[PDB]
Design a protein around this ligand. Structure first.
Ligand SMILES: Cc1cc2nc3c(=O)[nH]c(=O)nc-3n(C[C@H](O)[C@H](O)[C@H](O)COP(=O)(O)OP(=O)(O)OC[C@H]3O[C@@H](n4cnc5c(N)ncnc54)[C@H](O)[C@@H]3O)c2cc1C
Ligand SMILES: Cc1cc2nc3c(=O)[nH]c(=O)nc-3n(C[C@H](O)[C@H](O)[C@H](O)COP(=O)(O)OP(=O)(O)OC[C@H]3O[C@@H](n4cnc5c(N)ncnc54)[C@H](O)[C@@H]3O)c2cc1C
Ligand SMILES: Cc1cc2nc3c(=O)[nH]c(=O)nc-3n(C[C@H](O)[C@H](O)[C@H](O)COP(=O)(O)OP(=O)(O)OC[C@H]3O[C@@H](n4cnc5c(N)ncnc54)[C@H](O)[C@@H]3O)c2cc1C
Ligand SMILES: Cc1cc2nc3c(=O)[nH]c(=O)nc-3n(C[C@H](O)[C@H](O)[C@H](O)COP(=O)(O)OP(=O)(O)OC[C@H]3O[C@@H](n4cnc5c(N)ncnc54)[C@H](O)[C@@H]3O)c2cc1C
Ligand SMILES: NC(=O)c1ccc[n+]([C@@H]2O[C@H](COP(=O)([O-])OP(=O)(O)OC[C@H]3O[C@@H](n4cnc5c(N)ncnc54)[C@H](OP(=O)(O)O)[C@@H]3O)[C@@H](O)[C@H]2O)c1
Ligand SMILES: NC(=O)c1ccc[n+]([C@@H]2O[C@H](COP(=O)([O-])OP(=O)(O)OC[C@H]3O[C@@H](n4cnc5c(N)ncnc54)[C@H](OP(=O)(O)O)[C@@H]3O)[C@@H](O)[C@H]2O)c1
Ligand SMILES: NC(=O)c1ccc[n+]([C@@H]2O[C@H](COP(=O)([O-])OP(=O)(O)OC[C@H]3O[C@@H](n4cnc5c(N)ncnc54)[C@H](OP(=O)(O)O)[C@@H]3O)[C@@H](O)[C@H]2O)c1
Ligand SMILES: NCCC[C@H](N)C(=O)O
Ligand SMILES: NCCC[C@H](N)C(=O)O
Ligand SMILES: NCCC[C@H](N)C(=O)O
Ligand SMILES: [K+]
Ligand SMILES: [K+]
Ligand SMILES: [K+]
Ligand SMILES: [K+]
Ligand SMILES: [K+]
Ligand SMILES: [K+]
Ligand SMILES: [K+]
Lengths: 414, 415, 415, 414
């Protein structure tokens, strides 16, 4: 039984793919495999106050199909909260509500997703010129293999730690903040260091400050202060569906300009309101004579070691150009992520995949990896396309349009 | 050919009714009559900067049917502006764009509306009890009559002038501001008086100021300054579909409390952004030493008379408790509207319609007038239900739900 | 030793008076008496997030003297927080910081205030006509009497509880919320009822929600939802120094209009940010399936009784027009205040104080009580002048100008 | 008569210096020379809606003296507008009002400024070591020379045009926009091109759009859209008085970090409200079917030539790596400014003034140029200190403190 398309991973991207498949007139067979037990969308960072960075109109389908049964508005309506939500006049739902939205959509979905199913490898099918791929899936009980004419890889970002710093019992990446934090005796973390100057770092510091009144926090970051995230309407157009064509068709010179002028829309920047809330927090503490937030600016975390009951964090100060030690209970590294890389899963099919001058994967406008004639099956990427398609490649900004374009590409090539 | 339902008037209310009809599985026959040439939604007040007072989610259908082909989001999508609109992060479209939305929906609609068709009267059909009404329609050429088992009256508000002031060539109601304004030589409106302290008054004064740099404006109003319109989320709940049941089922006491505490959500109040814009305008003029906006507070317009080249406006000052005259070129009365009243159109049928203690029409929860057993056909009101259904009755706030409830009521009674 | 002026009470009002005295060229002798041990400015409501309802420019002196050593800006500068504050771009300091400001100013003040000194009575001095008053002061040790040519009464508002409800161990007025709250085992207050729809009620509910996650709160109020406080610039002008003259010189009709159109600026209304925050709180709880905030609208608290381990609150519902009981741990009444009334403290002198038609005290533009010629000494009111001077009489809005006008009045009669 | 201090230029900087002098207990003699007829603070850009980029608390004196007779609050009070202003709850006055503030303060000032007085040169006074400088002043009638123990140079920024584009009758720098614009028949500016992506460019396009309903505007800029200006409270601290010490004492590495992370607080960025207003303007025009604002992004103006009534603008497109011609009536270059340079004016005295590795002037913390021992007189810079003191050097952000620091330095050395 050979499937038209197999989806590796079930995050919002393949969920929107599943939705695009169901809404398409095309009769396409599909299968989806998720390693986790259920949809799990950055749960380690599902902090109480945390808010979507994207408008509710940027959902699973609305920009493609403005009257979808899987739209956020449909979700609100079924949950009987649409009117309530409208009264709030806020385009940004909480991260917590968006997670329910993902679950709700997955549930309404006709197709059944296979959970606890890790894709361990992708191999060429019996064939030359290869017309299918073989997908190795490992469940808790057995292992199996499925065959597909197309695959879509959407396995998400991978946590990046500071150079020379490894995860440990007392050194956590922000992606695993709540996992570790809920385990711990509160009074066990009176001193916390958080490295980074982006949204994650800011949200964690905020949470720590609001969660217990005695916790002392050290925010270590290279900038002089948090930098604001730009989502004003003209700059925000880099996230438009149409901006994908501009980026894609544009020269390397133009591509560089997107990153040069608008990196501050997405990376290493914090939302206005969180910045202002932290500042109010710090200000009221000074009035009260009880400072707790210590902002260590122009600085990098360069090392961590345990030493008795303390975590010894080594900080490099750019101002003085030297290092020093900071003793805390826990070090949280909110130091970001590296992009998706298909190269690992692909194993050997990589030999038939064409790379560019800089050594990265060539990708067509329709998100399909460029291959030699030896390979006739499709490898689509949702993620890992920053260099070809632009800043929206790993965001929720363009799920509806991308997923539809991939489904169209697959129907066209049948 | 007796229709299941005839709609009198084609504003947003009956348009949403038409949409509800098409969306319903029920096969209901209908006809709609509009006296204007096309949809015309307060065009006299379609000022350049004017913005909706209602969120885009409160459209023709979305609260009833979250995936409607007639939703504002569908409209944006077809007009290839959804992405652009989303980038703006504003829930409130311009009045101009909303007008576009109404036209767009009307066009997409299967039913063809009869324009240029004034309903002059509604009369009882044959038989007793009366099972149908007869609708008299006057077109420019001819006149005819159509029969219906149900009728929905949605003819809109009616302009209300100050007591003892009549509109003229130089005394306009705000509803007819742009009609008159575009037809006049710019150099002939150097002095304008605007009466009222509500949204209309504020918007007109703003426009006059932005429009020509030398125009002098007198804003005459009873309050000490513009009062802000409340649309904070808890108070704004009075516009919820569910709030209709609370108002309806509630005692007269409870009803009066809605009006007592939350009148300032709708009447005689101005949107925050417009108030602040007017204040910056006035402030910058003082810095420049060139004041043009004269705010005449604690005051009413009580008379107007034309004398040579001047419109002489008589103003009563509450502070001094005396009257005085103000000479201007034009007086604009932004003094509001009276509610829809089905009484005029109904004529003979009114005798079978039951009134309450205060002499107002009784209406069922499904917007159907209460009648004696002599009358079996359904008369539904979209508008004119402030006293039974609450503050949302004349607004866009609840179009989707109301229209659906009326269509359901009609399908039910057929069955 | 006869003083030019004695001040009864030391809240912001008399502290601005003390400042006005020090800044005046006039050599005036004065004494101030406060019952409390130190300045205590609504400490029972100094909640963590609580913010001033007045701009930092409206401080002890700035509107009268733009370069005062007692301005809020001076305070920030000395506390080394001016630059930090400026970066925040918020005109509204916290209530906590403002308290700091009051203490700082009081300290910087040359004059020494007499604390733990309750003024028990004011009596006529020797002579006829009366040229001085005698002020009876009770300290913890002794009692004494001081003599003054003028007296300024600024004793603040007095808590008002719902009719038929009395303070008790489990029934608190909002003014004494933190006093009782700190004094209670946290697991003893799992169910709280808060009566009222104003700023205090909103702030207390917000606090309860944020303080422990398990607390269930009943917000009981007559409106359908919190009503927003109007502070938009035109309406906000009723708080201007100049608005005092407009209100004062205006007819009773005009005075009524101020209250009729602009009570939404001050009484029974909630700040936009607080309303918004409460609504988000309620919304997120619904998403989580763990509702805690129960909004009981169109309702009054009409009684309270203690029954075993429960405070039984009797609630009247306007919608159903019937009463029912509500069992909670504590009832907090955030039901507002009655104005300052100089009369209690005046005793014998009040005979010579002229009242108006409605039986209230007549007051001159300079805040001086109108007396029959039998009295020659000056009695000034800071507070208790809502009926003569308008809505700013009990606020921080106009401290600088009011205090200056009273000092001027006193200097000019000494002359 | 040798003066303790002579001020070259009378903009906000030397005006705050004059104020600091008057408020100081020190009896210092001074003289100020301004070339223009009166205070003239970017009048070419005093557009109707234009707003200060700095809070009213950042005025001539308030951060140094919180109860100054020259504060903005004192100004409002005397102009009987304090209450009105307070009601409006806006920290940012209009540029127009701020200009009145400057005139008001200059007028209240006891000292009399010499206008129509251009400083043409600064020369060493008699003796070795040099204990004084000689200041050559050219008036319309005569020329004279004054002697000073110290000099403070505050001559402001100098307009910078695009490479290969010269000012002309139809090519204006933004600094001279209103000068040219008022002198033109309205029906002769139906097509305008504006080059630049900063505050000036945005403000001019806004004005053009709002001024006449038929004007067509081409906004040419290198970014994909306007980038928002960061003035959130943590990042905004780079403008703090204390941030000057951090920048000054910090290493070259730290200094670079200020510019790398926070250049978007000041250069090539546009205020949130202005961006939003332009976007609404463009949106409403699309609804009306009458587009007038053409945003030409990822582009530079590279040339201009007059060709029979059309100003022919040559535009380089980064996307297509191609150039092309655009015909308009006027080209406005809102392409920024170069910093103040004391070198111009100093002439012979440069020899006793020490440069750094990169060839820039060395300056002490108190804004005094570093000189060899052959020069003893003080040369102070208000402006031209970006490289030693940081981003606030040319701004209004820190007038009160800087001016006080300089007055103190002079009193201490006397
Ligand atoms: C806290 C946070 C941080 C973020 N960081 C960034 C950032 O740094 N840069 C940026 O551009 N966007 C970032 N995002 C956006 C983020 O990518 C996504 O919003 C969301 O995860 C969308 O991408 P996705 O569809 O690929 O889902 P991905 O959620 O991240 O997850 C898809 C699934 O792949 C599964 N998976 C992976 N490998 C296998 C396998 N071999 N077998 C089976 N299942 C597998 C995972 O278990 C997962 O459920 C962040 C968002 C949040 C909330
Ligand atoms: C400037 C402005 C002012 C407003 N004033 C108020 C106010 O004061 N109070 C309030 O609650 N809301 C007010 N509104 C809201 C207004 O009611 C609604 O936005 C909207 O028009 C209501 O929809 P409707 O369909 O019921 O009435 P409508 O849009 O007013 O009217 C529907 C149609 O009925 C037609 N019609 C009337 N009589 C006949 C007939 N005999 N035969 C055939 N057709 C007929 C009309 O020509 C019209 O096209 C105002 C809105 C604006 C923009
Ligand atoms: C939580 C809160 C609630 C408020 N409620 C209202 C309201 O309902 N309506 C309104 O218009 N404004 C209200 N305000 C404003 C309040 O009145 C002012 O902020 C402020 O306290 C007014 O100045 P006073 O100096 O007039 O105040 P009062 O501060 O309260 O100061 C009077 C002082 O005199 C002392 N005193 C009293 N009697 C004697 C005596 N016999 N002898 C010696 N000392 C005495 C008192 O101990 C007290 O310290 C409220 C403010 C807050 C923060
Ligand atoms: C529209 C606008 C654009 C701006 N552009 C920038 C920018 O690109 N980068 C930045 O950091 N800040 C910029 N600023 C800030 C600007 O520098 C400041 O606001 C302010 O003017 C700086 O203070 P100053 O005293 O140095 O002013 P400068 O006003 O410009 O004052 C110098 C004065 O000295 C006079 N002068 C010059 N030479 C002589 C001479 N030889 N003899 C006598 N008098 C002389 C000049 O005529 C002038 O009046 C801008 C501000 C505005 C409003
Ligand atoms: N609620 C939400 O939806 C939500 C929540 C969290 C994140 N996000 C999104 O996820 C994306 C990434 O956010 P992120 O904050 O996790 O990653 P990020 O934006 O790349 O932030 C990483 C930060 O860590 C700094 N850093 C790097 N190495 C360091 C070191 N050795 N020591 C100290 N600091 C160091 C970086 O400095 P440099 O600038 O020099 O690299 C940068 O400030 C963003 O698009 C963000 O908006 C969304
Ligand atoms: N979506 C939009 O663009 C838009 C535009 C306009 C209106 N609307 C809405 O539709 C409704 C229309 O209201 P409106 O603005 O037209 O008017 P309005 O709110 O009904 O009130 C009219 C105003 O005139 C005053 N007034 C009455 N008699 C007067 C007299 N004799 N002299 C002077 N002033 C007098 C009233 O004061 P009193 O309080 O004393 O009566 C009031 O200020 C509002 O609810 C509004 O929100 C929407
Ligand atoms: N109301 C006010 O107080 C006010 C008004 C105006 C300005 N200002 C202040 O003055 C400072 C700068 O103002 P500004 O806008 O005049 O200068 P600016 O911020 O330096 O802006 C210069 C702009 O010109 C662009 N550019 C340079 N060469 C170009 C070319 N050949 N073709 C097209 N574009 C070109 C730049 O692009 P690149 O980034 O690639 O160089 C940049 O976007 C700011 O701090 C601003 O806030 C204040
Ligand atoms: N980092 C995510 C930002 C979302 C983006 N501003 C958008 O509106 O698409
Ligand atoms: N003035 C119209 C009121 C709109 C109402 N707040 C609503 O959201 O439906
Ligand atoms: N472009 C000038 C900005 C100045 C800075 N935001 C400040 O407050 O000083
Ligand atoms: K399908
Ligand atoms: K399912
Ligand atoms: K149908
Ligand atoms: K149609
Ligand atoms: K004195
Ligand atoms: K001096
Ligand atoms: K002078």
């Amino acid at each position: 039984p050979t499937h038209d398309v197999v989806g590796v991973g079930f995050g919002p991207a393949n969920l929107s793919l599943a939705v695009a498949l169901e809404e398409s007139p095309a009769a396409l067979t599909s299968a989806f495999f998720e390693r986790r037990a259920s949809i799990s969308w950055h749960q380690g960072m599902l902090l109480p106050a945390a808010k979507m960075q994207v408008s509710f109109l940027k959902d699973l389908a609305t920009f493609r199909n403005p009257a979808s049964r899987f739209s956020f508005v449909s979700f609100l309506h079924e949950r009987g909260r649409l009117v309530r939500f409208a009264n709030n006049h806020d385009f940004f739902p909480t991260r917590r509500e968006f997670h329910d939205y993902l679950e709700w959509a997955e549930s309404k979905l006709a197709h059944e997703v296979s959970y606890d199913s890790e894709v361990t490898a992708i191999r060429p099918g019996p064939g030359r010129p290869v017309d299918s791929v073989l997908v190795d899936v490992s469940t808790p009980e057995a292992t199996r293999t499925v065959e597909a004419r197309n695959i879509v890889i959407s396995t998400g970002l991978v946590p990046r730690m500071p150079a020379g710093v490894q995860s440990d019992e007392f050194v956590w990446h922000s992606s695993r903040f709540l996992d570790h934090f809920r385990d711990r005796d509160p009074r066990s973390l009176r001193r916390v260091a958080v490295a980074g100057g982006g949204q994650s770092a800011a949200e964690i510091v905020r949470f720590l400050h609001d969660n217990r009144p005695d916790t002392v926090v050290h925010a270590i970051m290279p900038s002089y202060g948090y930098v604001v995230a730009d989502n004003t309407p003209f700059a925000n157009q880099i996230f438009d569906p149409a901006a994908v064509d501009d980026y894609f068709d544009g020269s390397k010179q133009a591509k560089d300009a997107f990153w040069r002028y608008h990196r501050n829309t997405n990376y290493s920047v914090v939302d206005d309101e969180v910045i202002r809330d932290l500042y109010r927090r710090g200000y009221d503490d000074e009035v009260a004579g009880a400072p707790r937030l210590n902002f260590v600016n122009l600085a990098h975390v360069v090392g961590a070691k345990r030493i008795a009951d303390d975590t010894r964090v080594t900080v490099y100060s750019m101002a003085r150009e030297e290092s020093y030690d900071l003793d805390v209970d826990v070090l949280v590294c909110a130091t970001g992520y590296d992009p998706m890389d298909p190269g690992d899963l692909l194993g050997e099919l990589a030999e038939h995949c064409v790379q560019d001058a800089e050594g990265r994967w060539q990708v067509d406008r329709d998100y399909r990896m460029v291959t030699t004639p030896d390979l006739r099956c499709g490898i689509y990427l949702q993620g890992g396309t920053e260099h070809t398609h632009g800043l929206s490649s790993s965001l929720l900004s363009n799920l509806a349009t991308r997923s539809g374009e991939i489904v169209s590409s697959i129907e066209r090539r049948k």
